[PDB]
Subunit: 258 residues, 4 copies
Amino acid sequence: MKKYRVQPDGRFELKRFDPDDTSAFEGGKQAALEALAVLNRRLEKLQELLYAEGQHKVLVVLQAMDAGGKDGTIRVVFDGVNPSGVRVASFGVPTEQELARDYLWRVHQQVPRKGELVIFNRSHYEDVLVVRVKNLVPQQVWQKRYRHIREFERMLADEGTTILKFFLHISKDEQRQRLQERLDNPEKRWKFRMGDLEDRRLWDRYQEAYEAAIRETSTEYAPWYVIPANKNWYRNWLVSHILVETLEGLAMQYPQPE
Amino acid sequence: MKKYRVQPDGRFELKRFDPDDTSAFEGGKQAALEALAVLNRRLEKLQELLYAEGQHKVLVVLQAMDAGGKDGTIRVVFDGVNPSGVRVASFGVPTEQELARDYLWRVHQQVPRKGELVIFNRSHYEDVLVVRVKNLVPQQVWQKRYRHIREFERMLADEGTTILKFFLHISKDEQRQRLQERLDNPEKRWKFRMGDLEDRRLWDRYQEAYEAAIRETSTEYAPWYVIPANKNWYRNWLVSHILVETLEGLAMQYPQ
Amino acid sequence: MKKYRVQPDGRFELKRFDPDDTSAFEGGKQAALEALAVLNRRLEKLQELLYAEGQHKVLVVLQAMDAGGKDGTIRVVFDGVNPSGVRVASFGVPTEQELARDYLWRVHQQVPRKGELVIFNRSHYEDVLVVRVKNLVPQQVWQKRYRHIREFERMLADEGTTILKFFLHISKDEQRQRLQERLDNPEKRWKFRMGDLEDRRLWDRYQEAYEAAIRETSTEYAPWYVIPANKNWYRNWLVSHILVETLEGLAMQYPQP
Amino acid sequence: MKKYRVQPDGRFELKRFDPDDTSAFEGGKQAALEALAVLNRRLEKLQELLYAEGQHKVLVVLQAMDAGGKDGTIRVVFDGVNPSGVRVASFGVPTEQELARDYLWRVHQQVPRKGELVIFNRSHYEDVLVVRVKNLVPQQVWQKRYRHIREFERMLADEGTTILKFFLHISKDEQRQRLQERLDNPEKRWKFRMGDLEDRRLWDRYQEAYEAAIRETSTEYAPWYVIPANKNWYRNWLVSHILVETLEGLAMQYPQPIVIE
Ligand SMILES: Nc1ncnc2c1ncn2[C@@H]1O[C@H](COP(=O)(O)OP(=O)(O)O)[C@@H](O)[C@H]1O
Ligand SMILES: Nc1ncnc2c1ncn2[C@@H]1O[C@H](COP(=O)(O)OP(=O)(O)O)[C@@H](O)[C@H]1O
Ligand SMILES: Nc1ncnc2c1ncn2[C@@H]1O[C@H](COP(=O)(O)OP(=O)(O)O)[C@@H](O)[C@H]1O
Ligand SMILES: Nc1ncnc2c1ncn2[C@@H]1O[C@H](COP(=O)(O)OP(=O)(O)O)[C@@H](O)[C@H]1O
Ligand SMILES: [Mg+2]
Ligand SMILES: [Mg+2]
Ligand SMILES: [Mg+2]
Ligand SMILES: [Mg+2]
């Protein structure tokens, strides 16, 4: 089941992962939806424990190509989970205030507190992704940032944060369909930006960047999971299974005051 | 259904509201749960519109006595609503940093942005509630805050925030049972502090403080709704109905 | 010198104030520099006592036209005052994050804490100034802001903030010279933006905007002082005098051992 | 100077530094005050350039024992420097909100922005000092924190922050006098807390904690300077000299960009 966990050997190659792979589930969509429903209930209970224990901090990082399933994952995986204990932090185009400080400043501000589960919809990884691909800074600058991230995450983990980093892996062809579906969708007509067409020619450069990022930052304290995300049902089930298992591993207990 | 909206006539009496009242729903639990399921789906859709339109700011304020149903309301009313568009801000015991600035500073920081629905689990109201009851500041101070709160909410509303204030009204006897269940439940035991028994002795002063605040701060731009909260099913349905109707009233539309 | 405090009668008139007026000081520059040196020393001591007492919050609001002397006031008036107790908060062009919430959100965040003296270099007033002049929101919206401002400042004052609002009043002709002097000084040329010229075309609308804000928001708890700011030496001495006297009035005492 | 810069060799021994040392200055009190006046003027001009250029991020970290001269340094070194470009961030006893996140969260929030000079009056170092001495977390937990700091400061420096860390070194005897003077002074008594006598009792444990911290975190990108701080005049001149020289080294330039009618 950890066939998707990227080992900290620095020997990662994205070619080994197929976006269309569904080998960890034996049953197809209908069966998987039932399985997800079970895990969602366990997740709801596990969050209730987390909030009650108030010791651990859970950080779920979502990274994907545009239309890679970031919003869809949050919406389906965290369906019915208490709003008081779960929070989404999105990282968009940096403001002048954000650029006036190091790139980790805006990110560090949003980290989960004790008893809180935080989802990062894009993250500090963007500073080794869009920044690298579009050469917003030279290689000399962004190359050093891998060490920064390893060390920043070491600090977070050592101080009590459970870090789960999910790479939602979709094919170039799947993305083409999803963006075309976005353009014909009336309630998604607004989600489209013109820049989505320029980043499309940069596909390979983005894939190279994801390969580099994952190889350099997947550690035992902060592992990367490559989720085959072409099938939404499989993506949702697998992300739920990984999170539920990790949270189960924490052996969280309800406190007693006497 | 707006028999629960507190009119801005400064003539409200809490006396007139029974925590055990269920008169706005023509039936019981089983039927009300079905009704809530329908409103929850509408709520999910209305939030989706809010986030997409990205113009309005929605502020839901929850105030209640301890074990009055604040966590329960958030959990049930907002079940299945997109986490990206909904946020809870809890107000606890003020820190030294928080006390070093005016009481509205910590609260103003958490207000909803455009396209966001924020729930305040306890609020700036505590500064005319626990503060008043325990005399954490003298009367001279906390008396002036009613005007502050009216004017701060006028500003929020004028600048595009839809404000819904819910008072979850439970009986002294219901609280006694709920707190006893907290002591008799291992998965509830944790929410308990010894101070929950002390505040119990201050019941009437807290009730007097709630009546006072609601009378002073329920306005046309920021109304107070007194929710009979003894029955969870009725509490959840009624808060959902009021929220859904208010959000419907905004005539929100998806962008072109 | 109470001749500069704008009474809360709602009958303020900016034509009654001359930027070139120096009548409150019985002398010129050389004598005023000496007088300012005395007040600056008292200000340094008063700040030490504010920080020590740790109860009051002091908010100094500076509003002026471009090249009206806001930065020079900070630099000279607060010279030698302990950095640990004094802070500047500047308000610029609002970000999308700042615009996504009410206009008072970014301003409320910067308010002085207990024992702190804060200077606002531009403020929440901007939201009834540049916003009004350039119609960034309609009249329907910015008209209601005067009440918001009065009530927000009432709340700050009631809760322990001493509020001093200074309008640094310069003439249209003085601004023309200063802006020209900016374009000629290499260590100042960087402060120049093309907008400084576009806003100069809007002089009168800005003046009308200042008369309206001052008339509407000068209260007992938060007064406005119209400082004739054409002469730097007079501007610096008069703001120092007003601040020092206000701080003296607080009769601040050292904590009980 | 490089005699006070702590080399990144991990062989630092605080015993090699005398709080009463004044060897870098030839002239005594009167001559040093004149020298400081000159450096203060250069500092004022250098800050004006920093704010105008708006590219560099400057972080001055002040660490000292109680009554070690932190407030005194800020007050004298930064005298007359424009408030708009200089900010003090003090770190006291953590709040429940601050404790609910990692210890670097509150500190990272206060880092200088572009064109700003920030002074940290106590810092993230407190989390390997008072925390270590009073065992507010176990050794297993605070031991890992040296690497965190090295790496956090590497990130800050790599991304554009000039980091100056000053350890204001006073003797046990000097502290005893200053604490007593605070007590007898009516305009200083207010600074006193009962814990000042507890942080006096643990002197050696604190000194051992400063030795370990400085030894572990003085790097090329973020050096530690041990300032002999028994003499205020020498302390003030030396911190001013180090800061001015560092700022001079940045070779800051004013930006480059019509008849007004
Ligand atoms: N560090 C960064 N530097 C530059 N651009 C960034 C950075 N972080 C995020 N971005 C960009 O910001 C954009 C956010 O777009 P937005 O529409 O707000 O979100 P979404 O990914 O849901 O479409 C992304 O296209 C992303 O590449
Ligand atoms: N302004 C305030 N001043 C003093 N106490 C406050 C203030 N606001 C909130 N509190 C108190 O903080 C406490 C928060 O308690 P906590 O257990 O964290 O939440 P809950 O109400 O869910 O039990 C409440 O008992 C409340 O009375
Ligand atoms: N509320 C506001 N809305 C719009 N513009 C604003 C607002 N507050 C400030 N501004 C503008 O931001 C600009 C800040 O410019 P800047 O160069 O950073 O400062 P300075 O006034 O020292 O030149 C001013 O020209 C001012 O008109
Ligand atoms: N990380 C921390 N953990 C515990 N105590 C801390 C921490 N950071 C700072 N402190 C303590 O906070 C206190 C600062 O408060 P105060 O007496 O008002 O000022 P000062 O440092 O000027 O003496 C110091 O005693 C210091 O040890
Ligand atoms: Mg509780
Ligand atoms: Mg409680
Ligand atoms: Mg300027
Ligand atoms: Mg002290």
